[PDB]
Amino acid sequence: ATKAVAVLKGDGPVQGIINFEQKESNGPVKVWGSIKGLTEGLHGFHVHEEVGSLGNVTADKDGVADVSIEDSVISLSGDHAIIGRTLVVHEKADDLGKGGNNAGSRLACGVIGIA
Ligand SMILES: [Zn+2]
Ligand SMILES: [Zn+2]
Ligand SMILES: [Zn+2]
Ligand SMILES: [Zn+2]
Ligand SMILES: [Zn+2]
């Protein structure tokens, strides 16, 4: 299995660890972790280039967002591998093109490195 981690650090209190595992080179990439020091509600969860959308993560009342995701779009290998890209949790929600009418500041960010 191929594995990676992102350690999200921000300017303010936002921080957290994100794991990625992919059993087959074309199968889904499992994504998990928690992120702390967020405002309650949805927060844009992207993979930049330095965008790819992993949707949003959801923070609870005291700022903690547990992330458990399975994504068959992202991959850790191949021409569009996310290793060496930067994982980003944003200030506002990604409305995913359904805002009723982009995702605010980057609050905390982390490079997706092989583990
Ligand atoms: Zn392995
Ligand atoms: Zn973004
Ligand atoms: Zn909590
Ligand atoms: Zn290509
Ligand atoms: Zn929108």
Curated annotation (Swiss-Prot):
Q: What is this protein called?
A: Superoxide dismutase [Cu-Zn]
Q: How does it assemble?
A: Homodimer; non-disulfide-linked. Homodimerization may take place via the ditryptophan cross-link at Trp-32. Heterodimer with SOD1. The heterodimer CCS:SOD1 interacts with SLC31A1; this heterotrimer is Cu(1+)-mediated and its maintenance is regulated through SOD1 activation. Interacts with DAOA; the interaction is direct.
What remark does the entry add? The protein (both wild-type and ALS1 variants) has a tendency to form fibrillar aggregates in the absence of the intramolecular disulfide bond or of bound zinc ions. These aggregates may have cytotoxic effects. Zinc binding promotes dimerization and stabilizes the native form.
* Positions that bind Cu cation: 46, 48, 90
MF terms per GO, please? copper ion binding; identical protein binding; protein homodimerization activity; protein phosphatase 2B binding; protein-folding chaperone binding; small GTPase binding; superoxide dismutase activity; zinc ion binding
Question: Member of which family?
Answer: Belongs to the Cu-Zn superoxide dismutase family.
Q: Which residues carry this modification: N-acetylalanine?
A: 1
Q: Where is this cross-link: 1-(tryptophan-3-yl)-tryptophan (Trp-Trp) (interchain with W-33)?
A: 32
Tell me the compartments it is located in.
Cytoplasm; Nucleus
| Entry keyword set | Acetylation, Amyotrophic lateral sclerosis, Antioxidant, Copper, Cytoplasm, Disease variant, Disulfide bond, Lipoprotein, Metal-binding, Neurodegeneration, Nucleus, Oxidoreductase, Palmitate, Phosphoprotein, Ubl conjugation, Zinc
Q: List residues modified as Phosphoserine.
A: 68, 72, 75, 77
Impact upon substituting residue 37 to R: In ALS1; mild form; ubiquitinated by RNF19A. Ubiquitinated by MARCHF5; leading to the degradation of mitochondrial SOD1
Q: How is the cofactor bound?
A: Binds 1 copper ion per subunit.
EC number in record: 1.15.1.1
Q: Where on the chain is N6-succinyllysine found, per UniProt?
A: 3, 9, 61, 92
What is the reaction catalyzed?
Answer: 2 superoxide + 2 H(+) = H2O2 + O2
Which PANTHER family does this entry report, sorted A to Z?
SUPEROXIDE DISMUTASE CU-ZN -RELATED
Mutagenesis or variant effect for residue 92 to E:
Mimicks constitutive succinylation state; decreased activity
> What pathology does the entry list?
Amyotrophic lateral sclerosis 1: A neurodegenerative disorder affecting upper motor neurons in the brain and lower motor neurons in the brain stem and spinal cord, resulting in fatal paralysis. Sensory abnormalities are absent. The pathologic hallmarks of the disease include pallor of the corticospinal tract due to loss of motor neurons, presence of ubiquitin-positive inclusions within surviving motor neurons, and deposition of pathologic aggregates. The etiology of amyotrophic lateral sclerosis is likely to be multifactorial, involving both genetic and environmental factors.
- Origin species, per record, is Homo sapiens
The observed outcome of changing residue 60 to A is: In ALS1; does not seem to be linked with a decrease in activity
Q: What job does the chain carry out?
A: Destroys radicals which are normally produced within the cells and which are toxic to biological systems.
Q: What is the effect of changing residue 92 to A?
A: Decreased succinylation
Which residues are noted in the entry as Zn(2+)-binding?
A: 53
> Matching Gene3D superfamilies, A to Z?
Superoxide dismutase, copper/zinc binding domain
Q: Which residues carry this modification: N6-acetyllysine?
A: 92
